[PDB]
Amino acid sequence: GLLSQENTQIRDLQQENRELWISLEEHQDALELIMSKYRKQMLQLMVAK
Amino acid sequence: GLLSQENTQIRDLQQENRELWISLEEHQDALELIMSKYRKQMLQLMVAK
Amino acid sequence: GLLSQENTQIRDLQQENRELWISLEEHQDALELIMSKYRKQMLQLMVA
Amino acid sequence: GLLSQENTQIRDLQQENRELWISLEEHQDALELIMSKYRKQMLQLMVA
């Protein structure tokens, strides 16, 4: 009965779920990268001083 | 037949879906607020200069 | 001669430079905090 | 007397101050871009 309208909708919602999580995860990585670069620049300024 | 295991799972997945969206939306607001404050400070520095 | 043009302009540039450093670190703290909230929300969704 | 201690230290503080301003704006551009990508991803999910 995996082909029922309900089981098909479950798999569609699980795919949407996964896409939302990937969106959150990709932006978590972007936040970490920008913070890493921001703190590396603060250190480069201190070193040059 | 709204009480079937499948229909119950659909409503659970829709609630999860909504929670993921709220997580994305709340952080969109946080990003906007921090950028607004960041640009307002750059202007306050320019004005004081 | 601390009232020299030299020593006076030094003091103004030092004040501006201190304000720029404070601006950089205050924004650091603000981004760190929204990243903390973001990460902890993801951790909460993940075990729910 | 541009080689005065006054005028020399002025120039160093001006260079540092310019670097701090560039740092602030470069990070502005970087955050604006990740916010752009984030917002456009949400818009894409919303019409999908």
Residue numbers in the entry:
A (entry chain A), B (entry chain A): 71 to 119
C (entry chain B), D (entry chain B): 71 to 118
Could you give the paper's own sentences about this structure?
Our results supported a “two-arm” architecture of the STRIPAK complex, with the PP2Aa/c-bound STRNs acting as an organizing center to hold Hippo or other MST kinases with STRIP1 as one arm and SIKE1-SLMAP as the other. Moreover, we determined the crystal structures of the second coiled-coil domain of SIKE1 alone, and in complex with an STRN3 peptide, as well as the structure of the first coiled-coil domain of SIKE1 in complex with the first coiled-coil domain of SLMAP. SIKE1 functions to bridge SLMAP through CC1 on one hand and STRN3 through CC2 on the other. In particular, we discovered SIKE1 as a key adaptor that recruits MST-bound SLMAP to PP2A-bound STRN, forming a molecular arm MST-SLMAP-SIKE1-STRN-PP2Aa/c.
To further characterize the assembly of STRN3-SIKE1 complex at the atomic level, we solved the crystal structures of SIKE1 CC2 alone (apo state) and in complex with an STRN3 peptide (residues 166–190) at 1.5 and 1.75 Å resolution, respectively. In the apo state, SIKE1 CC2 formed a symmetric homotetramer consisting of two parallel homodimers (chains A/B for one homodimer and A′/B′ for the other), namely a dimer of dimer with two dimeric units clamping each other in an antiparallel direction. As such, the N-terminal regions of SIKE1 CC2 formed a dimeric coiled coil, while the central and C-terminal regions formed a tetrameric coiled coil. Residues Q79, I80, L83, L90, W91, and L94 from each chain mediated CC2 homodimerization through hydrophobic interactions. In addition, N87 from chains A and B formed a pair of hydrogen bonds surrounding the axis of the coiled coil. Meanwhile, the four-helix bundle was stabilized by an extensive hydrophobic packing of residues L90, W91, L94, H97, L101, I104, M105, Y108, M112, L115, and M116 from each chain. Moreover, the coiled-coil assembly was further strengthened by hydrogen bonding among residues S93, L94, and Q98 from chain A, Y108 and R109 from chain B′, and Q111 from chain A′, as well as salt bridges formed between residues E102 from chain A and R109 from chain B′. As a first step, the SIKE1 CC2 homotetramer observed in the apo state would have to disassemble, producing two homodimers with an exposed binding site for STRN3. SIKE1 CC2 alone exists as a homotetramer (dimer of dimer), but forms a 2:1 heterotrimer with STRN3.
